[PDB]
Amino acid sequence: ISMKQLLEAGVHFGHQTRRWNPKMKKYIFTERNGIYIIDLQKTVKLVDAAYDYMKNVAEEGGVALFVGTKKQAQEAIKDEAIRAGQYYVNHRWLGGTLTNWDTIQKRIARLKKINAMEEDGTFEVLPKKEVAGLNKERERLEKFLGGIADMPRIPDVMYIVDPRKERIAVQEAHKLNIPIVAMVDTNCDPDEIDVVIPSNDDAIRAVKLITAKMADAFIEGN
RNA sequence: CAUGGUUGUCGUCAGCUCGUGUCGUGAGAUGUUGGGUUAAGUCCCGCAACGAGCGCAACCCUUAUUGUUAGUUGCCAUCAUU
Ligand SMILES: [K+]
Ligand SMILES: [Mg+2]
């Protein structure tokens, strides 16, 4: 990845100066027009390190979970996770998604069952109300758990966009001692993330750029 | 005022709870709250909650329309007689 690519994607932008986090001074370059500017030099070095780290995880046969519910990041992470073959959560991170993974597997099994009914033809012989109601249930299960329906075990690594937004996901990862690779913004906390990627979380182009790099790292590892 | 069984009562009011998860040193909390909606914890939406159970509802009986099968001890329009 290139510094010009980062700048074009707008990675450098941060949030308001008043809303920053002191720990981010380690990565902040300068403030312009009242908003902080991430140090793209450290960003390039750290994204390369994260690329290498994700590559190692992939080569180990590990499972990756891409997390982002930001309006900007939701669609981008879905596409890249699908492309990489690893699983994703993009609409809403359900509390206990991993700490209560055992419970969530029951809903995933329920989702698998409702899919089989369509293929089998139960829906055809199902009463109007039944099929309609079951279709609505299937829609909710897909909308929430769709991106992780086939995740075999607890992810070996969790990539996150804007942990400050994805507070709950970070907490579950810590509880399960799962490494976190996050797009950290000027108002976030870097201590919570093992592999920090100082970047703007509020730029769709930047999110696509960084997320695609991570997905390519996993693909290369495989 | 040792009990089983049976019953009244709030009240057919919409509540009462648990599993896992999470928060809290702890009793506890969350879900069950909140925006709507309903007769209803009824349902949708959002939510560190995700589900489930007892309730609610539905399945049951009766009443209100009707087809078909049946046509006597019931009914009498078409017919004649009493
Ligand atoms: K509990
Ligand atoms: Mg109920």
Side by side, the strands of the sheet bearing A64-67 are A87-89, A64-67, A157-161, A180-184, A195-198
Technique used to solve these coordinates: cryo-EM
Give the closest residue to A155 by CA, choosing from A76, A81, A91. A81
Count other C-beta atoms under 10 Å from residue A140's C-beta. Answer: 12
Q: How far apart are CA A222 and CA A210, in angstroms?
A: 19
- What is the three-class DSSP state of A208? helix
* A136 CA vs B58 C1’ separation (Å): 20
How many angstroms is it from A142 CA to the middle of ligand 2?
24
Give the closest residue to A197 by CA, choosing from A183, A211, A217. A183
Identify whether the C-beta of residue A206 lies closer than 8 Å to the C-beta of residue A9: yes
Which residues, other chains included, contact A192 with Cβ-Cβ below 8 Å and sequence gap of 6+? A163, A170, A174, A180, A182
Nucleotide nearest to A91 (CA to C1'): B46
Q: How far apart are CA A206 and CA A13, in angstroms?
A: 10
Side by side, the strands of the sheet bearing A28-32 are A13-16, A35-38, A28-32
List residues, Cβ < 7 Å, touching strand B.
A 92, 94-96, 99-100, 102-104, 106-107, 136, 140, 168, 171-172, 175
The token duo for A201 is 């979380």
Report chain B positions within 7 A of protein CB atoms.
Answer: 19-23, 44-51
Q: How far apart are CA A8 and CA A21, in angstroms?
A: 25
